Every structure is written in structure tokens, then in C-alpha cells.
Write a protein that binds this ligand. Structure first.
Ligand SMILES: OC[C@H]1O[C@@H](S[C@H]2[C@H](O)[C@@H](O)[C@H](O[C@H]3[C@H](O)[C@@H](O)[C@H](S[C@H]4[C@H](O)[C@@H](O)[C@H](O[C@H]5[C@H](O)[C@@H](O)[C@H](S[C@H]6[C@H](O)[C@@H](O)[C@H](O[C@H]7[C@H](O)[C@@H](O)[C@H](S[C@H]8[C@H](O)[C@@H](O)[C@H](O)O[C@@H]8CO)O[C@@H]7CO)O[C@@H]6CO)O[C@@H]5CO)O[C@@H]4CO)O[C@@H]3CO)O[C@@H]2CO)[C@H](O)[C@@H](O)[C@@H]1O
Ligand SMILES: [Ca+2]
Ligand SMILES: [Ca+2]
Ligand SMILES: [Cl-]
Length: 629
């Protein structure tokens, strides 16, 4: 039987769970897939409220796992995995073996440069630039008997709002789509949504392919998917807890553990440089593992021909601390129940755990917050690293890895999402490296939490950075990085971040015994429950300062390129964000949003983000278990 839990916080979790699963609240589609948010007019990472992401699916797993802990019923957890495998992990029909089996581990893909402005795309493929060797593909095909990859594609058009349908039929749902393709300056507002399965049926003469890639020949019909490593790692994290809590009650989630383990085996593709170039010596093609940084990079992607047989796979050269997950690495490298079937699966994850913890430490600022990350490909073209730039195993430090509109590390959220995982590791193992990191980080954040007399509160929202960490010397260790400073630009009341923060402080307090962290975690949970609860969970009114981009953001389209979206919207030079998403004008909130912009005001919204609601629910559960009295 499981240990007794705090009755008050357990009830709060159950209440949230009921609101989230309540059919009348609309968090899920008819097919059982959770939406990014109840509200449809939503632009953040995705550009429509009813698309879904792998991040959401992993939070759904975490939620159901906790429900199993308190109810003894894990059928919901197994169902979250069933929905994931059926709809977010490309099936045999979505990534045909005929093409995947033609993959050449000695020539994974063809080099394509990255540019700092979307106007430079399409990017020209260059067969003469070196590409390294993929050392794990043989391990995976031998272990699983297939050339298909088992990982979640990151974004899904749940109700086929864009109209691409499934495998170009234009009518089926859900629909595999993608957005980002053109460099660090292409924000959510500057993309051209495209189908993952491109048969040239929609868009331009050759679909949407020649908007991004340029080659000598004619663009072939092809499919392509992109993984979000932090999402897949969270799936492993959540499944571990589901397994632990299931066994404490004589229950089993064996089938799900097997899927989580397989996913973690394939997740190793994120450990490699985009084009398998040697880490620290980007101009040279890798010979195998010398191209592995062992960190959870921003993505790994793969694709292949539809009407011709060929395939490719790429890792990623850019690393952000926010995507790391030391807990998942500990699970996959030490727990016998989660040991990957591949020959080197567990050992690679063992190396990743150590490398990840060094990464966090190297990036810890003088104050305690964690800095951006590093890259093995300067400017995304393997250019020379500017002299005087600090390095980590040969990779140059970057303040805002991967994207700059806005800066990828200017949002407080990355701090809690990532440190929450370090707190789980510290709690389970008491690891000294995790302790050192948390003691200083927790001291920093506890001094940045502000509680008001009316029961409301504020935490860091937008942050900025100055300087850089000292070059990492494995034998020297943490120098203290006296020249690396974080700056809190402004505060806010982001309920999702606050929930993640409470979670982090709870695990840390439980292990360290730090009372300051424990009471702050409880005050956050109480404040949110007592002051921000509504019939659908929790929420607050927030300003949407970037919404002016709905109408004033021009979308770049190559000269002479013309095409049409499924609903007829014309794609040509000069269009704005709204011009290629005209269906948005039918949204219930549209007139309200436009009215505000016309009056020169900042639009405001009351949003119910699925991950935020789940975060809050899980945080209540965690407190209930670690502090029963
Ligand atoms: O036919 C002739 C011949 O053929 C051959 S076979 C041959 C084929 O023909 C050929 O087509 C094929 O070509 C291959 C090629 O080989 C491969 O090398 C390439 S690889 C390619 C890959 O496919 C593609 O997917 C990849 O895309 C990358 C981009 O490069 C990269 O730039 C971006 S970065 C992006 C991030 O990913 C996003 O997450 C991020 O999003 C941000 C957003 O920017 C930001 O605004 C918001 S801010 C937001 C916060 O999120 C929120 O929390 C807070 O609360 O609020 C704030 C404020 O709102 O955050 C978002 C994140 O959350 O944005 C950045 C920037 O865009 O990443 C994508 C990943 O997808 O690029 C790769 C290349 O660079 O693929 C080709 C396929 O076409 O090659 C074949 C051979 O190899 C045959 O053999 C012959 O016979 C035949 O004759
Ligand atoms: Ca931009
Ligand atoms: Ca700076
Ligand atoms: Cl969001």
C-alpha cells in the first residue's frame, strides 16, 4: 500500500482532475486528445488553441499517473499512452518502411545552412559539405526489428483546423503539421504552417517544400517529423512514477513501461550534432560517438520519400538547459525495469546524466539562476566561434539558444520546468551535484517570491542576462561564474510557472529540510487555490502584448512564389499573419481582440492552458505525498 497523503491537498488534486476530465469543460477533443488550451484564440508556441503538442501529451501522462496514485485506477494512465501511440507517434503508414529501410547510417542527411533571418530561405542543400556517421541506428533496428522511429512528433492539428487532413486527404483528423523551419528569427508569428506529409496537393507547385529547402532537382513528395526531446523525456519521467505508485498497490503498468523505455532508446538521437560533426571540432565529420554531446538538444528529426525510397535523420547542435532531464537519464540508466533493449541504451544515458549535471553547473550564474546553453554549430553554419567566447567541451556559450524572437532564455518558465527535474533526482538519490545546484538556485528564487496582503502574489516573469560563464574545466569544476549575472526585468502571476515552482520547492524541501522552501511552496499552492480558482480549474487575466502581430506581422514569401492554403487563402509576398489563417476571423473572441487593438489597447485574455492546469494539479499531489502532516 502507498504511504498516507495529506488529505487537504489530495482533495485539491482530485478536484482539479475532475475539472480537467469534465466533458463539459472541453479540455479534450472527441478522440480523447487534450488541446493546448480550452480557448481557441491562442498564440504562444503553437498558433492556434486547438492544436496539441507532445508537451501536452506528456503532462496528460503525468496527470493520469498521479490519479492512479490516489485512486488505485491506472486505466487512465494506460489510455494516455494508447492515445499517444495512435496519434502522435507516426505509424507505419505515416513513415513507410519502404523509405525508412533505405536509410544510410553513413550519410544520415544532406547539409543545409541555417540563417539569421527568414528572408534568406529556402536554404540550399550542399552535398559536398561533410556529414558524420550515425552509430546508433544499427542498435535500434536490431533491437526493435524496424527502421521506423519511436518518438512523438511535436505538434498536431487535432481537429484539422488548417485543412491538410491525414496524409493529404484534407478531411481526416487529427492532422500532422509543422510550423517553424526558418531560423532563430522566425517567431510563431512568422511561419507558414505546412503538412508533415507533403504530396504537393496543397500550397504551391511543389507543396510547401521549396519555401524551406532548395536543391538542384525537382522537389520530391516527402514526409518529415520533428521531435521535442523535453516532451519525450517527461513521458519517461511520468511513467517511472506511474510504475512506482502502481507497484505500491499491487497494480501494474507493464505495457506502458515498455513503450516509455522504447521511446527513451530512440530519444538518444537528440544526443548528436545535427549533421553528426565532431563535438568541439565542427569542421570535421564524426566517426560515431565523437559526434555526441550527450545532452538533450532542441530536437531530432527525420523524413523520407513518399513516391521514391530514401530517408534521412538529423540530431541538433543547439543545447538549452531548459530541455535537460537528469531524472529521466537516471531512470533509463539505473532502473532495471526501464533498461533500453539496445546494446548501448543504458550506458549512453549513464553518460548523459553526468554530462547534463556538468552542463547545469557550468551555466549557473553568480546569483543562482541557470544561463542559456551552448552550440556545436556557431550561427548554425559551423562557423568559427568568436575569440573570448566561453566553451563547454568545445561548444560555444549562447545566451539565448535556438531562437531570439523573443530570447529563448528571457522567460522564467525554463528555470522551473528544468530545475524541477533536478529536484526529483536529488530527492530520490541525494546526489551531491544536484544538491549544490539546488541550494544556490533555491536561495535565489526564494528571495524573488512576493506575497501581497490581498492574497495575490508575484514571481519573476521576464529575465535578462549579462556576461558569460567561465570556460568549463571538468577537473576544476564550478568557479562561481562571478561575471555571469541574471536580471529580473519584471514580475507576474503565471499560474503554470508558479505551479512548477511549488513542485520544485516541495521536492527540494522534502529532501533538504529547508523550511523556507516548504512554506513558500505551500503559500503558492494555497494562494492559487483560494484566489484563482474557477469552474474550469484556475486562471487569471493576462495581457497579450504581442497580439498586435496578428495584424501587423508580415510573413516572408520567396520572390515569385505563390500558393494556397487548403481553405483558399493565397500565399504570396506581402501577406500578414492573419491573411493565411482567415478562419481565425470566425473565432468567438476575434471581434473582442480586434476591438481592443483598434482602441490602442493591449488585449487581455483568461486562458486555461492544459499543461498549466495539469502542473497545478500535480503540484498539489506532490505536496500531499511529501508532507502528509
Ligand atoms: O529529388 C532529387 C534527389 O533526391 C534524393 S533524397 C534528398 C531529398 O530530395 C531532400 O529533400 C532531402 O532534404 C533533407 C535534407 O537532407 C536534410 O538535411 C533536411 S534537415 C531540416 C529539417 O527537415 C527541418 O525540420 C529543420 O527545421 C528546423 C530549423 O532548421 C530550425 O531553424 C528550427 S529552430 C525553431 C524551433 O524549432 C522552435 O521550437 C522555435 O519556436 C519558438 C518560437 O520561435 C518562439 O517565438 C516561441 S516564444 C514563447 C514561448 O514558447 C512560451 O513558452 C512563452 O510563454 O511565450 C513566448 C512568447 O510567445 O517559442 C517557441 C518554442 O517554444 O522557433 C525556432 C525558430 O524557428 O527548428 C526546425 C525544427 O523542425 O531544418 C533542417 C535543416 O536546417 O531536411 C531535408 C528535407 O527536405 O535530402 C535527401 C537526401 O538527404 C534522392 O536520393 C535522389 O535519388 C534524387 O535524385
Ligand atoms: Ca522575427
Ligand atoms: Ca545579454
Ligand atoms: Cl503556453
Amino acid at each position: 500500500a502507498s504511504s498516507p497523503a495529506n488529505k487537504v491537498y489530495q482533495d485539491r488534486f482530485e478536484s482539479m482532475y475532475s475539472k480537467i476530465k469534465d466533458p463539459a469543460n472541453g479540455y479534450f477533443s472527441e478522440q480523447g486528445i487534450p488541446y493546448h488550451s480550452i480557448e481557441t484564440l491562442m498564440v504562444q508556441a503553437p498558433d492556434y488553441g486547438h492544436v496539441t503538442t507532445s508537451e501536452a501529451m506528456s503532462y496528460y501522462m503525468w496527470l493520469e499517473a498521479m490519479h492512479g496514485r490516489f485512486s488505485g485506477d491506472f486505466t487512465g494512465f494506460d489510455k494516455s499512452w494508447s492515445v499517444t501511440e495512435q496519434y502522435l507517434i507516426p505509424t507505419e503508414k505515416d513513415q513507410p518502411n519502404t523509405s525508412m529501410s533505405r536509410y544510410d547510417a553513413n550519410k544520415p542527411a544532406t547539409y543545409a545552412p541555417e540563417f539569421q533571418d527568414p528572408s534568406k530561405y529556402p536554404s540550399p542543400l550542399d552535398t559536398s559539405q561533410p556529414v558524420g556517421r550515425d552509430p546508433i541506428n544499427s542498435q535500434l533496428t536490431s533491437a526493435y526489428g524496424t527502421s521506423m522511429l519511436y518518438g512523438m512528433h511535436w505538434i498536431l492539428d487535432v481537429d484539422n483546423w488548417y485543412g491538410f487532413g491525414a496524409r493529404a486527404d484534407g478531411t481526416s483528423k487529427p492532422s500532422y503539421i509543422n510550423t517553424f523551419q526558418r531560423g532563430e528569427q522566425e517567431s510563431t508569428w512568422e511561419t507558414i504552417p505546412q503538412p508533415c506529409w507533403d504530396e504537393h496537393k496543397f500550397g504551391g507547385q511543389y507543396g510547401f517544400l521549396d519555401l524551406f529547402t532548395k536543391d538542384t532537382g525537382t522537389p520530391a513528395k516527402q514526409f518529415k517529423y520533428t521531435n521535442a526531446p523535453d516532451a519525450d523525456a517527461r513521458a519517461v519521467q511520468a511513467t517511472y512514477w506511474a510504475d512506482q505508485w502502481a507497484k505500491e498497490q499491487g497494480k501494474s503498468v507493464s505495457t506502458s513501461v515498455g513503450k516509455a523505455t522504447k521511446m527513451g532508446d530512440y530519444l538518444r538521437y537528440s544526443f548528436f550534432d545535427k549533421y553528426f560533426r565532431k563535438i568541439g571540432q565542427p569542421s570535421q565529420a564524426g566517426t560515431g560517438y565523437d559526434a555526441a554531446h550527450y545532452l538533450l538538444s532542441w530536437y531530432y528529426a527525420w523524413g523520407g520519400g513518399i513516391d521514391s525510397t530514401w530517408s534521412w535523420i538529423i540530431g541538433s547542435s543547439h543545447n538549452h538547459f531548459g530541455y535537460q532531464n537528469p531524472f529521466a537519464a537516471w531512470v533509463l540508466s539505473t532502473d532495471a525495469n526501464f533498461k533500453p533493449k539496445s546494446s548501448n541504451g543504458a550506458s549512453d544515458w549513464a553518460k548523459s546524466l553526468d554530462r547534463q549535471l556538468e552542463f547545469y553547473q557550468w551555466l549557473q550564474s553568480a546569483e543562482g539562476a541557470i544561463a542559456g546553453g551552448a552550440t556545436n554549430s556557431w550561427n548554425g553554419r559551423y562557423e568559427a566561434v568568436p575569440s573570448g567566447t566561453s566553451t563547454f567541451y568545445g561548444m560555444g556559450y549562447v545566451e539565448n539558444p535556438v531562437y531570439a524572437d523573443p530570447g529563448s532564455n528571457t522567460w522564467f518558465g525554463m528555470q522551473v520546468w528544468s530545475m524541477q527535474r533536478v529536484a526529483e533526482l536529488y530527492y530520490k538519490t541525494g546526489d551531491a551535484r544536484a544538491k549544490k545546484l539546488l541550494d544556490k538556485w533555491a536561495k535565489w528564487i526564494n528571495g524573488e517570491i512576493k506575497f501581497n496582503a490581498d492574497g495575490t502574489f508575484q514571481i519573476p516573469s521576464t529575465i535578462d542576462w549579462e556576461g558569460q560563464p567561465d570556460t568549463w574545466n571538468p577537473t576544476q569544476g564550478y568557479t562561481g561564474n562571478a561575471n555571469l549575472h541574471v536580471k529580473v526585468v519584471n514580475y507576474g502571476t503565471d499560474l503554470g510557472c508558479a505551479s512548477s515552482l511549488a513542485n520544485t520547492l516541495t521536492y527540494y524541501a522534502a529532501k533538504s529540510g529547508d523550511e523556507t522552501s516548504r512554506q513558500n511552496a505551500q503559500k503558492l499552492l494555497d494562494a492559487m487555490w483560494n484566489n484563482y480558482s474557477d469552474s474550469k480549474g484556475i486562471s487569471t487575466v493576462e495581457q497579450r502584448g504581442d497580439y498586435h502581430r496578428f495584424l501587423d506581422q508580415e510573413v516572408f514569401v520567396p520572390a515569385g512564389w505563390t500558393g494556397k492554403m487548403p481553405n483558399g487563402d493565397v500565399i504570396k509576398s506581402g501577406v500578414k499573419f492573419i491573411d493565411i489563417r482567415s478562419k481565425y476571423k470566425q473565432d468567438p473572441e476575434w471581434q473582442t481582440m480586434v476591438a481592443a487593438l483598434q482602441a490602442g489597447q493591449v488585449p487581455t485574455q483568461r486562458l486555461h492552458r492544459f499543461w498549466a492546469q495539469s502542473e497545478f494539479a500535480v503540484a498539489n499531489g506532490v505536496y500531499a505525498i511529501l508532507f502528509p502532516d
